[PDB]
Amino acid sequence: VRETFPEATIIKPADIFGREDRFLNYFANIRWFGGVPLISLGKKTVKQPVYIVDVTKGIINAIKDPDARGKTFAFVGPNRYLLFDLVQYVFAVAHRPFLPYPMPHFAYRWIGRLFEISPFEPWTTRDKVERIHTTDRTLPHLPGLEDLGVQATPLELKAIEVLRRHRTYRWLSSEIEDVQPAKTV
Amino acid sequence: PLTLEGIKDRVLYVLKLYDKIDPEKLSVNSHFMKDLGLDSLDQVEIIMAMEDEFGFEIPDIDAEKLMCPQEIVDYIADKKDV
Amino acid sequence: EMVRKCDPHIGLLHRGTEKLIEYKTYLQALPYFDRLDYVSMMCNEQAYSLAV
Amino acid sequence: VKQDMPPVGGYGPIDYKRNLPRRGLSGYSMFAVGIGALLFGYW
Amino acid sequence: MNLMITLLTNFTLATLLVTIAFWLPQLNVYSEKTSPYECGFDPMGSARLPFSMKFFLVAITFLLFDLEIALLLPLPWASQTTNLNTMLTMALLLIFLLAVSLAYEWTQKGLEWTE
Amino acid sequence: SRGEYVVAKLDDLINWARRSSLWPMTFGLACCAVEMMHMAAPRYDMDRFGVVFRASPRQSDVMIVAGTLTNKMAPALRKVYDQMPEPRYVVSMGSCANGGGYYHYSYSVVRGCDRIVPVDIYVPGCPPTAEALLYGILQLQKKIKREKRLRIWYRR
Amino acid sequence: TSVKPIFSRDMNEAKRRVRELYRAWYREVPNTVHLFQLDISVKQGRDKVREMFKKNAHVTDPRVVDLLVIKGKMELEETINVWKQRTHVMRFFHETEAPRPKDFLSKFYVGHDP
Amino acid sequence: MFMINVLTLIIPILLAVAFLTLVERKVLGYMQFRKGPNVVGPYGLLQPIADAIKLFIKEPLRPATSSISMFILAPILALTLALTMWIPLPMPYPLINMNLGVLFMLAMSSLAVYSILWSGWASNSKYALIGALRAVAQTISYEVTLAIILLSVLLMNGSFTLSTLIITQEQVWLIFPAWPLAMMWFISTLAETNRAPFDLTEGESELVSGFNVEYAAGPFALFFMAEYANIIMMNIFTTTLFLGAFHNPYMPELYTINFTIKSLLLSITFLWIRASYPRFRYDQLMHLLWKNFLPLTLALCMWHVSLPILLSSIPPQT
Amino acid sequence: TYKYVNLREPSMDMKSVTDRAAQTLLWTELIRGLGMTLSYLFREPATINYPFEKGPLSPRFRGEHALRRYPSGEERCIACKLCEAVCPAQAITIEAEPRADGSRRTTRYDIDMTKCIYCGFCQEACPVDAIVEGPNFEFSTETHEELLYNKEKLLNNGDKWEAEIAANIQADYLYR
Ligand SMILES: CCCCCCCCCCCCCCCCCC(=O)OC[C@H](COP(=O)([O-])OCC[N+](C)(C)C)OC(=O)CCCCCCCCCCCCCCCCC
Ligand SMILES: CCCCCCCCCCCCCCCCCC(=O)OC[C@H](COP(=O)(O)OCCN)OC(=O)CCCCCCCCCCCCCCCCC
Ligand SMILES: C=C(C)[C@H]1Cc2c(ccc3c2O[C@@H]2COc4cc(OC)c(OC)cc4[C@@H]2C3=O)O1
Ligand code: SF4
Ligand code: SF4
Ligand code: SF4
């Protein structure tokens, strides 16, 4: 696309989360399978997710501004997270029993082929595994949300908005401040 | 609730939990409006924070006559035994 | 299931008939009366006709 | 002229009254039928 | 044996008309379609509040009249005995005690409802 | 192909089962509730088509917005529509539900129910006749008949 | 200029009723955030109640702030009882509007509005 | 071949229920000066297939506040107790020939309340809980005569076997010695089975749907064809109790046709009482089965206890 | 000139008291209701076979709008804007200019059918019978802007339905 349309604005979102995402709802749909298995305890990968209202404001402020011709933006969240305490923060906002266990690097793709045998929308695959366990690179030489006049919204304001659906009734209306914030890196 | 030392320390602690009061100029004889630089609404939520922690309700006539932490600890000393 | 207090909140169908009447002529103000008591249409037509 | 008018002799009279025609048996006859049903069943 | 096979088959295709009903359509669930129903607007409070029973003396006395048909029930068998007048007397005595109980609940404002 | 033929027959089957048993919900608002009742009357009779009322949103296929959508009952209509299971349809009945109608310029009318809910059939009138409302339901059936659910499912 | 009062004789009772109304809102806001299960915190709601009280903080007429206490108590009466909904509470929080440009050059750019 | 014996029972009383929905809609249509469904198939004979296929592909909608274990356990138990109450009914020979089949029917009539009851509790709503405790208020009303009328009608049968009851009524219908018990049992069965004038838990006017206002399709089909299975089973039960037909042991098909058409006429009687009557306030349900039906039920119980001793007509227990 | 509903003191002889006791115990009025319902069971119901049959109407009926024409091809709308001055919904937008032969004709005749109240002040205020509210009621849509009729769609309705609208006005113009 860069070599066939030279003024194309190419935008890099890291890991978008919303009400209809495949990132936080994905992390809240492994109370069905077992105890949310992770590669190498999920401690060797670092993420920074960005909220979809900020990415949409960035795309529209890229449409409006003629300073976006040929650029290459990089939309990232303001706070970086490890994967393990991210999943533990999701299961603490969702107020679920969290018991993690490491599934190894060679046998978790064999569970990844167990779900991609479906003609439906498959539940998970080894590609989603290789993307969750791919850490978010930091690109300082590329512009972001602050180079479009967009203030990035952090995760602790909108994870409750995403994850109020996945709660049981016994903690259905627990407040936003009734959870511990995760550990940024 | 027993002695004025612990009551005064609890007043100053509830005051320094409030993120607009500077703990540097906050004394027992510092003034809220013209010296700490607070609105009336700031003073009224200070009074309601004291009603939460101390656990008794102060009416409106004697929640405006509290213009320094000395007056707060004195009025709590009037509404208690000590 | 015994009834202690009934409080009917109304105005879920409030459309502002008698403000739209002030900005239209009399012949234009008639078809609001079809739509007030919409099972007593020509009655309200007759009442507004007797008023005018 | 040629206008919508009623006919010259008027219309027929229109009934507008209650007509609940009082059908059914008496009370004693219904209890007689019921007690006869019980006695035949018991025999 | 065969009764348990019949009951298990009934439970089987009473839950296999359920498991073919959940996984069959496309579940598109978002956080309003599973909200509680209070005829359009939002519900006031929870539904697990104390929901007061006005028909409570009738609901107690239903138990004491349902023990009666743990007592009155062997009468199609007690009619087969050779101590007949005592059976007749005790049967009419139990239905009479039920009737005295029902009339005492009648007259002393029991079968009416409170409030 | 052969699997394409199977999913085409299954599309015909399930779209037939969804169009020949439309369940509207008892949702009147204004004068069009009278004509919606007359579409349920003995003369025009929705239920000969397999079309019967169910008052709960959990057990209804279509919501006929019969009447005026004011500014005080926008969230009630939206939550009533959102509590309907998929597939759900909306037949916008009458002029106030279509585009505000006779109270379009007024302060307390949502100018068309398409602002609040997605609308599949627009039935124009003030009120549209119960025969024309029945024609709107039949055009909804002609919209459900040409759904292509499992064809697009197999071709994705 | 000799008119009939509503509740207050002068600004002392008027500030008393404004102050008691704000006391009521500060007591109430956690219940509002809880039962409407809003995605906001208690701090942002109390900031909004502060903004709504400082929006009208220039009145010197006792009857006008008497009616403002009356309208604030009607808002309180419809907030404590669940007569408002999630939308009616969140209409104070202008989340869906485009942010209105305040300076002169952007207002010059986007339209004819002074 | 007992498995095929069960599957020739329970699937046709999943088809009789399905086309009973068509009979209900069309009889309720012509009794209300309209037509029923006749566009779907030839004169409606493919309507219940459409209503069946439509619901099971509609989104199941587990509620976010509901107790999901009880919420799924309740319609399974509803359709289970709809199916398992056909087995002691003599058709003319029952599938399971119990010595005490009538108490089996009565105890499963007591148990089938809990599906409605747990469905109204577990579906965490206000209307559902109103419909659950009104089912409590309905069952404490009909169970205080559904046992004594059933007791007094089995003082002329001989035992609690439903196969004995055909031998009992060989001379005359048992409606002739017990028409007050028949006309009181019939209303006990209308209050038992949530048909109008005793809907009250499917009450579309006071509530929206009562207990199943939260049950979306999929599980709502298993209250649809549970409740109508209850009404066909209860018409056949009152048919065997009061209208037992001529049984020839060499030709069971004559009796099967005869009680089929009698139970069809009583099912049309259900759909025809639903087609004409207003609905009780749910205390007048309770002020009927306690203030009007229960004293006369005790009186007729005394009469049917003391009457075979008065006439030497004590039935055999064999 | 007035009557008392429900002021019937009942008879209290043993005959009528026994009759009402049998009416209570043996359910007489319930059998009366069952008899009336069974008597409407055995009729021909009034369900008409739509869409192969249609509902009865009259030539005054007010449905989908149309612009008519003279019997020489020239359109009737001489752009005089009474129909937007009387339209209670203000659903009609008219702009005009002198065309090539100098005749006063429209260039914009919009009728917003989702504003229109179908009351026919336009077809009775038009001094040349240009705008008429035709007999078409089966003109439902699937998209909202399809019900925003401009001049072209109204001329197409007029040319499409003129064989019916001209006969209805021919049958009705003596009552107006
Ligand atoms: C099983 C085969 C079919 C059975 C019959 C099927 C057809 C009949 C059903 C018709 C439709 C009913 C639909 C639901 C109706 C609900 C209302 C209802 O039932 O109300 C009950 C009504 C209630 O009456 P009520 O509520 O109007 O009572 C008046 C009360 N006050 C004054 C306070 C207002 O009637 C009964 O309860 C009657 C009970 C049964 C009567 C049996 C009488 C036996 C007589 C024996 C002889 C007596 C003579 C003296 C002694 C002689 C001794 C030898
Ligand atoms: C105990 C007794 C219980 C009885 C229960 C059932 C009662 C009703 C029985 C069915 C009554 C008739 C139903 C007819 C359905 C329509 C059949 C048909 O011809 O459909 C035409 C359609 C399109 O075909 P096309 O090639 O376009 O031809 C049109 C010509 N221009 O082609 C199609 O739609 C495809 C073919 C569909 C065939 C469907 C047949 C009916 C299925 C009903 C289920 C029950 C089966 C029978 C059970 C009893 C007998 C064993
Ligand atoms: C069930 C059938 C066959 C009929 C009856 C009926 C409907 C559809 C909708 C409704 C309805 O009746 C109820 C009660 O009566 C009115 C009367 C109304 O106005 C007189 C009114 O106006 C909004 C609304 C309503 C309800 C309403 O929404 O179809
Ligand atoms: S579109 Fe008009 S006639 Fe119809 S309900 Fe609305 S106000 Fe009444
Ligand atoms: S019928 Fe429609 S277009 Fe004509 S005047 Fe009335 S509202 Fe306006
Ligand atoms: S339609 Fe008739 S009234 Fe309207 S501008 Fe044209 S000629 Fe005049």
| CB-CB contact of H210 with H201 (8 Å) | yes
Contacts of B79 (CB under 8 A, 6+ apart): B56, B58
> Do the chains C and D touch each other, judged by at least 3 C-beta pairs below 8 angstroms?
no
CB contact under 8 A, F95 and I117: yes
How far is the centre of ligand 1, averaged over its atoms, from the C-alpha of H179 (Å)?
11
No. of H helices and E strands in chain D?
1, 0
Backbone angles phi, psi at H282, to 5 degrees: -75, 0
User: Would you call H130 exposed, middle or buried from its count of C-beta atoms within 10 A (0-12, 13-18, 19+)?
Assistant: buried
CB contact under 8 A, H213 and F61: no
What single letter denotes the amino acid at residue H293?
F
Measured CA to CA, the distance from residue I95 to residue I109 in angstroms comes to: 7
The length of chain I is: 176
E36 closest CA partner among F58, H311, A12, B75:
F58
For the CA of H15, the closest atom of ligand 2 is: 3
Q: How many domains does chain H have?
A: 1
Task: Report the run of H or E that residue E25 belongs to, with start and end.
Answer: none
H34 interfacial to chain I (CB closer than 8 Å):
yes
| Pocket probe mutation, ligand 3, options F27, F37, F63, max atoms within 8 Å of Cβ | F37
How far is the centre of ligand 1, averaged over its atoms, from the C-alpha of H165 (Å)?
25
| CB-CB contact of H74 with H118 (8 Å) | yes
Rg of chain C in Å (alpha carbons): 15
Task: Spell out where chain B is interrupted, by the residue before each break (C to N > 2.5 A).
Answer: none
- Omega into A181 within 30° of 0, i.e. cis? no
How many angstroms away from the CA of H30 is the closest CA of chain I? 5
| I132 pocket-lining for ligand 6 (C-beta < 6 Å) | no
Give me the active site residues of B, please: 39
How many angstroms away from the CA of E46 is the closest CA of chain H? 8
Which domain does E74 fall in, by range?
1-115
**What experiment produced this structure?**
cryo-EM
Which residue's C-alpha comes closest to atom 39 of ligand 1? I25
CB contact under 8 A, C28 and I119: no
Three-state secondary-structure class, residue E56:
helix
E95 interfacial to chain H (CB closer than 8 Å):
yes
Backbone angles phi, psi at H111, to 5 degrees: -80, -30
Q: Which residues 74-113 on chain G approach chain E with CB closer than 8 angstroms?
A: 81-82, 85-86
Which ligand sits closest to the CA of I83? 6
Q: Which tokens belong to G84? A: 């408002």
| F128 pocket-lining for ligand 4 (C-beta < 6 Å) | no
E21 interfacial to chain H (CB closer than 8 Å):
yes
Measured CA to CA, the distance from residue I120 to residue I59 in angstroms comes to: 13
CB contact under 8 A, F70 and C35: no
C2 interfacial to chain E (CB closer than 8 Å):
yes
3-state secondary structure chain B: CCCHHHHHHHHHHHHHHCCCCCCCCCCCCCCCCCCCCCCHHHHHHHHHHHHHHHCCCCCCCCCCCCCCHHHHHHHHHHCCCC
Three-state secondary-structure class, residue I69:
strand
Q: Which tokens belong to H171? A: 């001379």
Candidates H29, H34, H276; nearest CB to I37? H276
Q: Which tokens belong to H269? A: 């009687």
B40 interfacial to chain G (CB closer than 8 Å):
yes
Q: What is the DSSP string of H219-283?
A: TSHHHHHHHHHHHHHHHHHHHHHH-----BTTBHHHHHHHHHHHHHHHHHHHHHHTTT-----TT
How many other CB atoms are found less than 10 A from the CB of residue E107? 9
Measured CA to CA, the distance from residue G74 to residue I151 in angstroms comes to: 51
| H273 pocket-lining for ligand 1 (C-beta < 6 Å) | yes
CB contact under 8 A, E115 and C1: no
Could you give the C-alpha distances from H219 to E14, I6, I17, in angstroms and in order? 10, 48, 52
How far is the centre of ligand 4, averaged over its atoms, from the C-alpha of E40 (Å)?
21
Sign of torsion over alpha carbons A116, A121, A127, A128: negative
| CB-CB contact of H162 with H90 (8 Å) | yes
| Pocket probe mutation, ligand 3, options F23, F25, F26, max atoms within 8 Å of Cβ | F26
Three-state secondary-structure class, residue I54:
coil
The length of chain A is: 185
CB contact under 8 A, I115 and F45: no
| CB-CB contact of I92 with I122 (8 Å) | yes
CB contact under 8 A, I142 and F134: no
User: Would you call A3 exposed, middle or buried from its count of C-beta atoms within 10 A (0-12, 13-18, 19+)?
Assistant: exposed
| H242 pocket-lining for ligand 1 (C-beta < 6 Å) | yes
| CB-CB contact of A50 with A145 (8 Å) | yes
Contact list in G for residue B48 (CB cut-off 8 A) is 23, 26-27
How far is the centre of ligand 5, averaged over its atoms, from the C-alpha of I119 (Å)?
6
Helices (H), chain H: 2-10, 12-30, 47-55, 68-83, 101-111, 113-122, 126-146, 148-153, 164-168, 179-192, 221-242, 252-273, 286-289, 293-311
Match 């939990």 to its residue by tokens: B17
CB pairs B-G closer than 8 Å: 20
Contacts of D26 (CB under 8 A, 6+ apart): I15, I18, I19, I22
Residue I64 C-alpha from the chain's centroid: 10
Measured CA to CA, the distance from residue F56 to residue F63 in angstroms comes to: 11
| CB-CB contact of I89 with I115 (8 Å) | yes
| CB-CB contact of F102 with I89 (8 Å) | yes
Q: Which tokens belong to C26? A: 């009399």
H296 interfacial to chain D (CB closer than 8 Å):
no
| I86 pocket-lining for ligand 6 (C-beta < 6 Å) | no
Task: Report the run of H or E that residue H156 belongs to, with start and end.
Answer: none
E80 interfacial to chain F (CB closer than 8 Å):
no
Contact list in G for residue B44 (CB cut-off 8 A) is 19, 22-23, 26
CB contact under 8 A, D27 and I21: yes
A16 bridge partner residues: A50
What single letter denotes the amino acid at residue E49?
L
For the CA of I86, the closest atom of ligand 5 is: 5
Could you give the C-alpha distances from F91 to F62, F94, F120, I144, in angstroms and in order? 7, 10, 6, 12
CB contact under 8 A, E115 and C2: yes
Resolution (A): 3.7
Candidates F56, F82, F85; nearest CB to E32? F82
| CB-CB contact of B43 with B51 (8 Å) | no
H181 interfacial to chain D (CB closer than 8 Å):
no
Candidates F16, F17, F48; nearest CB to H35? F48
How many angstroms away from the CA of A173 is the closest CA of chain G? 6
Contacts of F79 (CB under 8 A, 6+ apart): E32, E35, E40, E41, E42
Annotate A111-143 with b (16+ C-beta within 10 A) or e (fewer): bbeeeeeeeeeeebbeebbeebbeebeeeeeeb
Cα angle for residues H12, H18, H23 (degrees, 5° grid): 115
> Do the chains E and G touch each other, judged by at least 3 C-beta pairs below 8 angstroms?
yes
D36 interfacial to chain I (CB closer than 8 Å):
no
A51 bridge partner residues: A17
Cα angle for residues B26, B30, B34 (degrees, 5° grid): 110
Task: Report the run of H or E that residue F122 belongs to, with start and end.
Answer: strand F121-123
Backbone angles phi, psi at I52, to 5 degrees: -85, -20
Q: How many domains does chain E have?
A: 1
Q: Which residues 18-47 on chain E approach chain F with CB closer than 8 angstroms?
A: 25-26, 28, 32-33, 35, 37, 40-42
I75 bridge partner residues: I69
| F98 pocket-lining for ligand 4 (C-beta < 6 Å) | no
Contacts of F42 (CB under 8 A, 6+ apart): H32, H33, H34, I45, I46, I47
Inter-residue long-range contacts of A85-91, CB under 8 Å, 24+ positions, other chains counted: A85/A182, A85/A183, A86/A27, A86/A47, A86/A182, A87/A27, A87/A36, A87/A38, A87/A42, A88/A182, A89/A155, A89/A159, A89/A179, A89/A180, A89/A181, A89/A182, A90/A24, A90/A27, A90/A28, A90/A159, A90/A163, A91/A27, A91/A28, A91/A36
Question: In this structure, are strands A81-82 and I65-67 parallel, antiparallel, or unpaired?
Answer: unpaired
CB contact under 8 A, A165 and H66: no
| Pocket probe mutation, ligand 6, options I67, I74, I77, max atoms within 8 Å of Cβ | I77
User: Would you call F147 exposed, middle or buried from its count of C-beta atoms within 10 A (0-12, 13-18, 19+)?
Assistant: middle
